[PDB]
Design a protein around this ligand. Structure first.
Ligand code: NA
Length: 132
């Protein structure tokens, strides 16, 4: 049968996100973490099975990407108070792509300031960043 026709793909979504958000270099993110990450919340948006396999950034807060809006919005029944804090929110995933979309979503909602980690946890690990 005729296949599905995708007319808006990840390329378009990622371009829109990337040009609107801070992409924090892996090295800068690692340095930020080592400084104590004052007034920063590092948000791990990976599936828990990814986290179990590969580990995580120490002290990061887990919120899967698919739940993000529901935990950010204070008017959501599922609101998490951490997202109301007067801090910079740095999102990360495995390779940097989901987290660009997540940062853009959060920014679109009004969360400010936001960023994501270039190359994700994969790049973090490759650089020898802190891992739990
Ligand atoms: Na950018």
């Amino acid at each position: 049968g005729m296949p599905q026709t995708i007319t808006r793909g990840i390329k378009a979504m990622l371009d829109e996100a990337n040009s609107s958000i801070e992409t924090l270099t892996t090295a800068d993110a690692i340095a930020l973490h080592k400084s104590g990450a004052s007034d920063v919340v590092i948000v791990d948006i990976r599936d828990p099975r990814e986290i179990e396999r590969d580990g995580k950034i120490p002290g990061s807060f887990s919120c899967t990407r698919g739940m993000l809006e529901f935990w950010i919005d204070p008017q959501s029944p599922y609101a998490k108070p951490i997202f109301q804090e007067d801090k910079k929110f740095v999102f990360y995933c495995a390779g940097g792509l989901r987290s660009a979309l997540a940062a853009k979503t959060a920014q679109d909602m009004g969360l400010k300031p936001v960023a994501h980690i270039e190359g994700g946890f994969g790049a973090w690990r490759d650089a020898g960043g802190p891992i739990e």
